[PDB]
């Protein structure tokens, strides 16, 4: 249920792969969910219907 991708710091977006296609969604603006490092991991959780762009590198 989790779909991984990479985030854009400038745009605060997550690009993730699901069902053969790349999808670009906004990250949250929350302090510890936003995209902090360009091109680092993000995930769309299709169970919870949430996005997180702040992972440990
Ligand atoms: Cl595509
Ligand atoms: Cl969200």
CA distance 29 to 37: 14
The enclosing H or E element of 54 equals none
The residues with which 37 forms a beta bridge, in sequence order, are none
Q: How many residues does the chain have?
A: 57
Q: Give the ligand whose atoms come closest to the C-alpha of residue 17.
A: 1
17-28 b/e with 16+ CB inside 10 Å = b?
Answer: eeeeeeeeeebb
CA 41, 47, 50 angle in degrees (round to 5)?
Answer: 50
Q: Give the ligand whose atoms come closest to the C-alpha of residue 34.
A: 2
CA distance 51 to 43: 6
Half-sphere exposure (Cβ direction) of 38: Cα atoms closer than 13 Å: 3
How far, in Å, from the CA of 28 to the mean position of ligand 2? 6
Q: Give the ligand whose atoms come closest to the C-alpha of residue 50.
A: 2
Structure obtained using: X-ray
How far, in Å, from the CA of 53 to the mean position of ligand 2? 10
Please count the structural domains in the chain.
1
**Best CA proximity match to 35, nearest among 53, 50, 16:** 53
CA distance 38 to 21: 21
Structural domain harbouring 47: 1-57
Resolution (Å units): 1.3
How far, in Å, from the CA of 6 to the mean position of ligand 1? 14
In the three-class reduction of DSSP (H, G, I as helix; E, B as strand; rest coil), residue 29 is classed as: coil
């Amino acid at each position: 249920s989790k779909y991984g991708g990479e985030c854009s710091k400038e745009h605060n977006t997550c690009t993730y792969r699901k069902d053969g296609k790349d999808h670009i969604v906004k990250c949250p603006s929350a302090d510890n969910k936003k995209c902090k490092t360009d091109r680092h991991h993000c995930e769309y959780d299709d169970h919870h219907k949430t996005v997180d762009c702040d992972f440990r590198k």
